[PDB]
Amino acid sequence: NSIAIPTNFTISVTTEILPVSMTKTSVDCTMYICGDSTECSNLLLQYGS
Amino acid sequence: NGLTVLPPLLTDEMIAQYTSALLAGTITSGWTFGAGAALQIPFAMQMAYRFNGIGVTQNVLYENQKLIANQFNSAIGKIQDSLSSTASALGKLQDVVN
Amino acid sequence: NSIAIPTNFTISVTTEILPVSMTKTSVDCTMYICGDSTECSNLLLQYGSFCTQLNRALTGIAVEQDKNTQEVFAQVKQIYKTPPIKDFGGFNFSQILPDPSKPSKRSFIEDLLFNKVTKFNGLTVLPPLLTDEMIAQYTSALLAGTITSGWTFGAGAALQIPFAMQMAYRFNGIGVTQNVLYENQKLIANQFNSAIGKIQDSLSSTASALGKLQDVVNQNAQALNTLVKQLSSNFGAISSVLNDILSRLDPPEAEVQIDRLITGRLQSLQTYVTQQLIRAAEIRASANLAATKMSECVLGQSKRVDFCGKGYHLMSFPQSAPHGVVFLHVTYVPAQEKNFTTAPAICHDGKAHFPREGVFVSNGTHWFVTQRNFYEPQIITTDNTFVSGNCDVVIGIVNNTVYDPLQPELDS
Amino acid sequence: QSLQTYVTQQLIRAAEIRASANLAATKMSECVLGQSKRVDFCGKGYHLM
Amino acid sequence: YQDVNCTEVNVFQTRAGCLIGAEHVNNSYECDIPIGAGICASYQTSQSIIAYTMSLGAENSVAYSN
Ligand SMILES: *[C@@H]1O[C@H](CO)[C@@H](O[C@@H]2O[C@H](CO)[C@@H](O)[C@H](O)[C@H]2NC(C)=O)[C@H](O)[C@H]1NC(C)=O
Ligand SMILES: *[C@@H]1O[C@H](CO)[C@@H](O[C@@H]2O[C@H](CO)[C@@H](O)[C@H](O)[C@H]2NC(C)=O)[C@H](O)[C@H]1NC(C)=O
Ligand SMILES: *[C@@H]1O[C@H](CO)[C@@H](O)[C@H](O)[C@H]1NC(C)=O
Ligand SMILES: *[C@@H]1O[C@H](CO)[C@@H](O)[C@H](O)[C@H]1NC(C)=O
Ligand SMILES: *[C@@H]1O[C@H](CO)[C@@H](O)[C@H](O)[C@H]1NC(C)=O
Numbered sequence: 001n002s003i004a005i006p007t008n009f010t011i012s013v014t015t016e017i018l019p020v021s022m023t024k025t026s027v028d029c030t031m032y033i034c035g036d037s038t039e040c041s042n043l044l045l046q047y048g049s
Numbered sequence: 050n051g052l053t054v055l056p057p058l059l060t061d062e063m064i065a066q067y068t069s070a071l072l073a074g075t076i077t078s079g080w081t082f083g084a085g086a087a088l089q090i091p092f093a094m095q096m097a098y099r100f101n102g103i104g105v106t107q108n109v110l111y112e113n114q115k116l117i118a119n120q121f122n123s124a125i126g127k128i129q130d131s132l133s134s135t136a137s138a139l140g141k142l143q144d145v146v147n
Numbered sequence: 148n149s150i151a152i153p154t155n156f157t158i159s160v161t162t163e164i165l166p167v168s169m170t171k172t173s174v175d176c177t178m179y180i181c182g183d184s185t186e187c188s189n190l191l192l193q194y195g196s197f198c199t200q201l202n203r204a205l206t207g208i209a210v211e212q213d214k215n216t217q218e219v220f221a222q223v224k225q226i227y228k229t230p231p232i233k234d235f236g237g238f239n240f241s242q243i244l245p246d247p248s249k250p251s252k253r254s255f256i257e258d259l260l261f262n263k264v265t266k267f268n269g270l271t272v273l274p275p276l277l278t279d280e281m282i283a284q285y286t287s288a289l290l291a292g293t294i295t296s297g298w299t300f301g302a303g304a305a306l307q308i309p310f311a312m313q314m315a316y317r318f319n320g321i322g323v324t325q326n327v328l329y330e331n332q333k334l335i336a337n338q339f340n341s342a343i344g345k346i347q348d349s350l351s352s353t354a355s356a357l358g359k360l361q362d363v364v365n366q367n368a369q370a371l372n373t374l375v376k377q378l379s380s381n382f383g384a385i386s387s388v389l390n391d392i393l394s395r396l397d398p399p400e401a402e403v404q405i406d407r408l409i410t411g412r413l414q415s416l417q418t419y420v421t422q423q424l425i426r427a428a429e430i431r432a433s434a435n436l437a438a439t440k441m442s443e444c445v446l447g448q449s450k451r452v453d454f455c456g457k458g459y460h461l462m463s464f465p466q467s468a469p470h471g472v473v474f475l476h477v478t479y480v481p482a483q484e485k486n487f488t489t490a491p492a493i494c495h496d497g498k499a500h501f502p503r504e505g506v507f508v509s510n511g512t513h514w515f516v517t518q519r520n521f522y523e524p525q526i527i528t529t530d531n532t533f534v535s536g537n538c539d540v541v542i543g544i545v546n547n548t549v550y551d552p553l554q555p556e557l558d559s
Numbered sequence: 560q561s562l563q564t565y566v567t568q569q570l571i572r573a574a575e576i577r578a579s580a581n582l583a584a585t586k587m588s589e590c591v592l593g594q595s596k597r598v599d600f601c602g603k604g605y606h607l608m
Numbered sequence: 609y610q611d612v613n614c615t616e617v618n619v620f621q622t623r624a625g626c627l628i629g630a631e632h633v634n635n636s637y638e639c640d641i642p643i644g645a646g647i648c649a650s651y652q653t654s655q656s657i658i659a660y661t662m663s664l665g666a667e668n669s670v671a672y673s674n
Contacts, residue, residue: 025053035050049373094491236674305670311674451589
């Protein structure tokens with residue numbers, strides 16, 4: 001037979017932080033593996049796609 | 050080495066314009082801009098609806114409007130003090146970068 | 148001191164299209180890495196379980212496509228069927244209900260969706276457990292339940308309710324007073340019927356509307372084409388054709404050339420399976436979002452804003468599509484905005500008065516109370532409003548008068 | 560092999576970001592554009608705005 | 609036998625492949641061990657493995673009226 005009822009209130013503001021995106025990197029797989037090398041690039045082609 | 054970074058389509062300025070629009074909508078038209086047209090509403094009345102929505106009769110807002118506005122204004126000032134001093138506050142975004 | 152209350156609405160049906168499963172591919176890796184070759188197979192055994200964990204990973208993806216499809220569609224304990232007579236208060240579902248004339252008894256709009264969407268090397272495609280004819284019994288059950296019984300078939304057994312009383316219930320859900328339906332029932336029925344008409348025009352004309360489902364089918368087809376093309380690479384070997392190595396070299400030399408091909412084909416299969424495992428998580432999160440929208444939008448009415456497209460949500464009708472689902476989300480959108488002066492409260496006999504429901508508004512000479520979502524003015528009385536406190540407290544209160552329904556009954 | 564490792568990690572990480580972005584989008588609609596009846600969805604306490 | 613005809617291999621041809629050893633039963637039941645293409649199998653009656661088109665649930669019309 002007992003209830004607690006609030007008699008006053010407070011307005012609070014909280015901050016919620018969420019990631020939305022990540023850096024749009026791009027890597028040139030040929031230049032990374034065989035940078036400026038014809039001999040290496042031709043070998044790389046043997047790996048297809 | 051062939052590693053480059055592409056820019057985002059939406060620049061920081063464009064994002065700011067969107068948050069501005071969402072904020073201006075929220076303040077001057079409540080939720081009506083979400084459903085359809087932005088229908089202007091006195092801010093205090095908008096808050097009255099927000100109070101009814103949590104099970105608190107609207108007269109509470111009006112009778113305590115000065116208190117509520119003061120608590121709100123103080124709460125925002127506290128947000129600034131926290132963000133300006135606690136680096137860890139943005140850890141969720143800093144971690145992505147790292 | 149100004150509130151805009153819309154004097155009219157429009158009912159908008161918005162299509163939302165969701166992937167729900169993807170092609171149940173499965174690959175006999177021991178055939179892909181070494182095809183009909185004993186010499187190669189014996190070398191592939193030196194890699195232990197690198198094959199059976201790929202047979203296993205792809206089987207895990209293939210098994211869960213039926214889990215996704217069962218969780219999205221099988222949300223109903225019985226196959227409900229529509230009555231013979233279509234006495235739905237003017238609403239016309241005939242374009243979303245089954246066509247008994249068809250061999251697989253899809254609706255008219257399900258046939259548009261099934262039209263707009265388009266090996267020997269150990270690769271296979273396992274069938275779904277639910278045929279597209281069984282998916283169409285489940286969406287017809289969800290839909291014949293939704294039409295005849297509202298949300299109640301999600302809570303218990305289906306309880307029948309007339310469709311003009313089911314939409315009156317959903318109008319109270321968006322806070323619009325249900326007489327705004329009955330006083331406009333032909334206009335609302337006609338806007339629903341006309342908005343279902345636009346869905347056919349969209350889906351018949353514009354093949355790019357299905358873009359998510361065709362993207363999922365293209366990614367799976369592009370991955371298989373990449374996987375099959377990767378059989379043609381040498382990977383440092385004298386030849387990509389295993390039989391040409393074996394027919395030309397003695398074992399002490401053939402094994403070296405074969406190991407080069409095995410390494411390349413195994414890494415190239417692990418690449419496919421890793422891409423499919425990440426792509427299956429991307430579809431599983433879309434199946435759980437489709438299952439959640441089925442449960443909250445179709446079996447219910449959602450209070451979540453913009454969950455069921457733009458507008459205040461009224462109801463949704465599921466239609467099936469190849470490896471997906473489509474929700475025809477019906478929403479109330481308020482349309483003809485009007486301007487009014489507005490008051491937070493009203494002063495009468497020293498007391499302050501506030502609206503139990505609705506907004507105090509002024510066309511410019513008189514004050515009325517009215518629901519927020521639809522301009523419907525009412526003379527302000529003790530039945531529309533409650534007293535709390537007095538005039539000296541509210542900021543921006545106005546000195547109108549509030550009428551008492553008892554006075555003339557005791558005055559006369 | 561190094562690139563494959565990198566790309567795989569980026570795809571997995573991207574999925575995490577996407578899930579966060581989806582959550583953020585959900586909140587924007589059901590928190591900023593509306594009012595949330597969902598508990599602790601929009602901070603602790605009874606959500607107003 | 610997945611994706612084959614009952615040629616090269618109590619035989620039931622399904623779109624999932626050629627199923628051998630399971631009795632084809634006209635009665636539908638709740639799905640137990642899924643095969644594919646609407647077909648599931650189970651061990652029932654004296655007992656043997658049976659195959660059937662799975663039931664999607666009981667049929668129940670709603671007594672809708674204006
Ligand atoms: C509810 O609590 C607020 C404080 O959060 C009370 O307002 C304060 O009242 C004291 C006097 O007792 C002042 O010294 C403070 O400066 C006031 N603070 C603010 C922010 O106004 C308020 O009176 C309480 N209300 C009730 C009904 O008890
Ligand atoms: C605002 O609405 C009220 C009520 O409709 C208008 O006052 C009535 O106007 C009609 C038409 O002129 C008269 O027949 C009534 O006798 C008026 N009294 C009532 C019923 O309140 C009022 O004119 C409207 N605002 C404007 C445009 O002045
Ligand atoms: C309300 O008043 C503004 C004044 O700037 C006007 O632009 C707007 O069109 C008016 N709305 C209606 C519905 O008349
Ligand atoms: C099996 O072959 C027969 C012809 O002998 C053909 O009619 C039947 O459709 C084939 N079934 C399958 C599943 O390929
Ligand atoms: C199903 O019943 C039909 C008669 O309507 C019969 O010809 C057919 O052989 C039965 N099939 C099985 C699997 O019992």
